[PDB]
Amino acid sequence: TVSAPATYGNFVLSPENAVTAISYHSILADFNSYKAHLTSGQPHLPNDS
C-alpha cells in the first residue's frame, strides 16, 4: 500500500515577482528569500521552491 500524494502542488507568484516580471521579464523563485539571505549573509537555502 503506497502512500502516494493526493493532490497537485501549486506555485503562487510573489508580489515582488510581479515587478521583475514586468521590468525584466524574469522571475527568480522566492525573491523575498534571497533578500533575507543576502542580508543575513547565509549561503545555503533550506529548499529551492
Binding site: 507568484l13 510573489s14 515577482n17
Partner: protein, 49 residues
C-alpha cells in the same frame, strides 16, 4: 422718408423684407481600443498578482 418740396417728386414708402439661413458643419473624432485591452476588461482569468 423725408417730406419733399415744391415741384420735386415725392418719395414712396418702401417696406423691405429679408431672411437669414442656418448652416450645418458637424465634427467627429475616432478613438480605438485594442482587443487585447478589451479582453482583460471583461474576461478575467485565474486571479493572479
Amino acid at each position: 422718408r423725408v417730406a419733399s418740396g415744391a415741384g420735386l417728386p415725392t418719395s414712396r414708402q418702401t417696406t423691405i423684407m429679408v431672411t437669414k439661413y442656418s448652416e450645418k458643419s458637424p465634427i467627429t473624432i475616432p478613438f480605438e481600443l485594442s482587443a487585447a485591452c478589451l479582453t482583460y476588461l471583461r474576461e478575467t482569468f485565474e486571479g493572479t498578482i
